[PDB]
Scaffold this active site. Structure first.
Site, PDB file in Angstrom:
ATOM      1  N   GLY A 196       0.830  -1.190   0.000  1.00 18.30           N
ATOM      2  CA  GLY A 196       0.000   0.000   0.000  1.00 18.30           C
ATOM      3  C   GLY A 196       0.869   1.246   0.000  1.00 18.30           C
ATOM      4  O   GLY A 196       1.979   1.256   0.532  1.00 18.30           O
ATOM      5  N   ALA A 197       0.371   2.299  -0.622  1.00 18.21           N
ATOM      6  CA  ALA A 197       1.089   3.566  -0.660  1.00 18.21           C
ATOM      7  C   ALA A 197       0.097   4.710  -0.440  1.00 18.21           C
ATOM      8  O   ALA A 197      -1.100   4.581  -0.738  1.00 18.21           O
ATOM      9  CB  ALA A 197       1.847   3.725  -1.993  1.00 18.21           C
ATOM     10  N   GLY A 198       0.588   5.822   0.096  1.00  9.98           N
ATOM     11  CA  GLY A 198      -0.278   6.944   0.388  1.00  9.98           C
ATOM     12  C   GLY A 198       0.437   8.239   0.708  1.00  9.98           C
ATOM     13  O   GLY A 198       1.641   8.393   0.508  1.00  9.98           O
ATOM     14  N   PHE A 213       1.355   9.500   3.445  1.00  9.02           N
ATOM     15  CA  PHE A 213       2.267   9.534   4.583  1.00  9.02           C
ATOM     16  C   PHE A 213       3.437   8.562   4.551  1.00  9.02           C
ATOM     17  O   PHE A 213       4.416   8.717   5.285  1.00  9.02           O
ATOM     18  CB  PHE A 213       1.477   9.367   5.869  1.00  9.02           C
ATOM     19  CG  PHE A 213       0.470  10.454   6.082  1.00  9.02           C
ATOM     20  CD1 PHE A 213      -0.886  10.197   5.936  1.00  9.02           C
ATOM     21  CD2 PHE A 213       0.881  11.752   6.389  1.00  9.02           C
ATOM     22  CE1 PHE A 213      -1.821  11.210   6.121  1.00  9.02           C
ATOM     23  CE2 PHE A 213      -0.048  12.770   6.575  1.00  9.02           C
ATOM     24  CZ  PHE A 213      -1.401  12.500   6.444  1.00  9.02           C
ATOM     25  N   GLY A 214       3.335   7.568   3.693  1.00  5.11           N
ATOM     26  CA  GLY A 214       4.386   6.594   3.564  1.00  5.11           C
ATOM     27  C   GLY A 214       3.849   5.358   2.872  1.00  5.11           C
ATOM     28  O   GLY A 214       2.828   5.409   2.173  1.00  5.11           O
ATOM     29  N   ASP A 225      -8.679   7.372  14.251  1.00  3.37           N
ATOM     30  CA  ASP A 225      -8.873   7.055  12.831  1.00  3.37           C
ATOM     31  C   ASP A 225      -9.513   5.685  12.597  1.00  3.37           C
ATOM     32  O   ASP A 225      -9.035   4.875  11.789  1.00  3.37           O
ATOM     33  CB  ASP A 225      -7.560   7.179  12.063  1.00  3.37           C
ATOM     34  CG  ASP A 225      -7.773   7.346  10.568  1.00  3.37           C
ATOM     35  OD1 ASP A 225      -8.899   7.705  10.157  1.00  3.37           O
ATOM     36  OD2 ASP A 225      -6.809   7.117   9.802  1.00  3.37           O
TER      37      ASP A 225
HETATM   38  N1  LIG Z   1       0.569  -5.502   8.913  1.00  8.48           N
HETATM   39  C1  LIG Z   1      -0.018  -5.530   7.693  1.00  8.48           C
HETATM   40  N2  LIG Z   1      -0.188  -6.703   7.035  1.00  8.48           N
HETATM   41  C2  LIG Z   1      -0.768  -6.752   5.828  1.00  8.48           C
HETATM   42  N3  LIG Z   1      -1.207  -5.623   5.243  1.00  8.48           N
HETATM   43  C3  LIG Z   1      -1.069  -4.409   5.853  1.00  8.48           C
HETATM   44  C4  LIG Z   1      -0.462  -4.351   7.116  1.00  8.48           C
HETATM   45  C5  LIG Z   1      -0.484  -3.007   7.509  1.00  8.48           C
HETATM   46  C6  LIG Z   1       0.036  -2.207   8.649  1.00  8.48           C
HETATM   47  C7  LIG Z   1       1.365  -2.372   9.031  1.00  8.48           C
HETATM   48  C8  LIG Z   1       1.890  -1.557  10.029  1.00  8.48           C
HETATM   49  C9  LIG Z   1       1.123  -0.565  10.639  1.00  8.48           C
HETATM   50  O1  LIG Z   1       1.696   0.210  11.631  1.00  8.48           O
HETATM   51  C10 LIG Z   1       1.047   0.540  12.795  1.00  8.48           C
HETATM   52  C11 LIG Z   1       0.386  -0.451  13.520  1.00  8.48           C
HETATM   53  C12 LIG Z   1      -0.261  -0.143  14.716  1.00  8.48           C
HETATM   54  C13 LIG Z   1      -0.242   1.168  15.201  1.00  8.48           C
HETATM   55  C14 LIG Z   1       0.427   2.172  14.487  1.00  8.48           C
HETATM   56  C15 LIG Z   1       1.076   1.852  13.288  1.00  8.48           C
HETATM   57  C16 LIG Z   1      -0.192  -0.371  10.220  1.00  8.48           C
HETATM   58  C17 LIG Z   1      -0.735  -1.183   9.211  1.00  8.48           C
HETATM   59  C18 LIG Z   1      -1.065  -2.319   6.475  1.00  8.48           C
HETATM   60  N4  LIG Z   1      -1.429  -3.149   5.512  1.00  8.48           N
HETATM   61  C19 LIG Z   1      -2.096  -2.542   4.327  1.00  8.48           C
HETATM   62  C20 LIG Z   1      -1.477  -2.821   2.977  1.00  8.48           C
HETATM   63  C21 LIG Z   1      -2.537  -2.253   2.036  1.00  8.48           C
HETATM   64  C22 LIG Z   1      -3.888  -2.398   2.749  1.00  8.48           C
HETATM   65  C23 LIG Z   1      -3.581  -2.886   4.159  1.00  8.48           C
END
Ligand SMILES: Nc1ncnc2c1c(-c1ccc(Oc3ccccc3)cc1)cn2C1CCCC1
Ligand SMILES: [Ca+2]
Ligand SMILES: [Cl-]
EC number: 2.7.10.2
Length: 429
Positions: free
Chosen positions: A184-186, A188-189, A296
């Protein structure tokens, strides 16, 4: 002299951890938290073992049919997981009668379908049948049902616990990682599927240099780290140098939003959809209990495990950094985010879940939405959505925050949405 026993198989993957098989006994040499020092009686090797891969010998946790620290509702999810059958059962610590046990059995109800009934234990369930070990109890009800809804088949399919993260490895050097697929991209990072030190699959959120202070973020991440619950995504590690990376468990099915719009998600019937939202409210009741705030909450920030466990991600991240359609009116008009404005968000998410990921307020612009809420408009009940589910949403969307319910309350409702209180446990003659 403490002897423990391996509940699962385990390959060592670090410098000084031990390999062992289910059945291996070991001498505990030190209890340092997630990793313990031990001596395998099979190999005569001294090293480290995951403290949750073992228990004391002849202890209840050794038993296939026994499940420690599992809640009535989670017990119920485990027995309805694939690979179980009629009569599939388990024995667990009771939540209500503390220090006592309960039996949970898989059933088929004429009207409801596959369910799970629960019974208490005091050892006896019934006066007409007393035993002195739970093992005694178990074999009796495997040998015909002396009352129960079903005779005991085989014990519940057990998950294998997650590997604990490397000891003292909260901060890791960027070099330990290979970011292999951008997920995923957006703004913020990005998020990437990655590998840590060639042995462990993880996800990484790469953060773009921002507001920001790394020292201010790292202070928040330390807090995030202490928020550990089955329904929050688990933080493993962080790379402290800009650009900051956050390392977490990988979630096989990605975001709830993406999963609901998928084919596998389209097949999910209403009671599972509700189960999902109950899992989320559980995670949110935890956050509420810890006096934290999410800020959020929406389907994009829920992740889904391979075995359909829902996990909250990005908690408290927004404090450190335009989804107004999930945003409570006092958060929009005054920037006042509380657990209550999260409740409001949960309502929208609930509507998101029930409409298989459809966008909230379909065909309405952000401003159009804001003015609409000012008149007291709310989204109408969709087709598949039950009236009582819709009533929860409406309670979440009170104009006054303080008239919005607690997640603790929401969880308790969602959890038992199809079970009358009196029917939570069974009665036995
Ligand atoms: N951990 C994940 N595993 C699979 N997909 C993930 C993630 C995560 C993920 C990873 C780390 C993250 O960092 C935090 C986790 C908890 C609190 C704050 C930041 C948040 C989401 C995102 N995605 C996205 C990709 C596109 C749609 C879903
Ligand atoms: Ca109804
Ligand atoms: Cl020895």
């Amino acid at each position: 002299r403490i002897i423990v026993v391996a509940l699962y198989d385990y390959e060592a993957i670090h410098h000084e951890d031990l390999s062992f098989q289910k059945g291996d006994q070991m001498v505990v040499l030190e209890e340092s938290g997630e990793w313990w020092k031990a001596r395998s009686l099979a190999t005569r090797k001294e090293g480290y073992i995951p403290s949750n891969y073992v228990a004391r010998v002849d202890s209840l946790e050794t038993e296939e049919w026994f499940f420690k620290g599992i809640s009535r509702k989670d017990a119920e999810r485990q027995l309805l997981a694939p690979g179980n059958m009629l009569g599939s059962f388990m024995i667990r610590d009771s939540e209500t009668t503390k220090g006592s046990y309960s039996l949970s059995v898989r059933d088929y109800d004429p009207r409801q379908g596959d369910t799970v009934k629960h019974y208490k234990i005091r050892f006896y369930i019934s006066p007409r049948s007393t035993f002195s070990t739970l093992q005694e109890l178990v074999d009796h009800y495997k040998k015909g049902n002396d009352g129960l809804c079903q005779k005991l088949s085989v014990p519940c399919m057990s998950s294998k616990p997650q590997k604990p993260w490397e000891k003292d490895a909260w901060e890791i050097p960027r070099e330990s990682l290979k970011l292999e697929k951008k997920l995923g991209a957006g703004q913020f990072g990005e998020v990437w599927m990655a590998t840590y030190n060639k042995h462990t699959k993880v996800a990484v959120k790469t953060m773009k240099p921002g507001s920001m202070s790394v020292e201010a973020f790292l202070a928040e991440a330390n807090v995030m780290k202490t928020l550990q619950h089955d329904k929050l995504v688990k933080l493993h590690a962080v790379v402290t140098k800009e650009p900051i990376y956050i390392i977490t468990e990988f979630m096989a099915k990605g975001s709830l939003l993406d999963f609901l719009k998928s084919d596998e998600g389209s097949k999910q019937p209403l009671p599972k959809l509700i189960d999902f939202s109950a899992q989320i409210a559980e995670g949110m009741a935890f956050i509420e209990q810890r006096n934290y705030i999410h800020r959020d909450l929406r389907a994009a920030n829920i992740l889904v495990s391979a075995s359909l466990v829902c996990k909250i991600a990005d908690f408290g991240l927004a404090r450190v950094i335009f989804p107004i359609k999930w945003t409570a009116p006092e958060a929009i008009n005054f920037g006042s985010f509380t657990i209550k404005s999260d409740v409001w968000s949960f309502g929208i998410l609930l509507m998101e879940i029930v409409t298989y990921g459809r966008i909230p307020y379909p065909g309405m612009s952000n401003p159009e939405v804001i003015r609409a809420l000012e008149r007291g408009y709310r989204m109408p009940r969709p087709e598949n959505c039950p009236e009582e589910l819709y009533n929860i949403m409406m309670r979440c969307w009170k104009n006054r925050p303080e008239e919005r319910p607690t997640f603790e309350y929401i969880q308790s409702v969602l959890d038992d949405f199809y079970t009358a209180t009196e029917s939570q446990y069974e009665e036995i003659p």
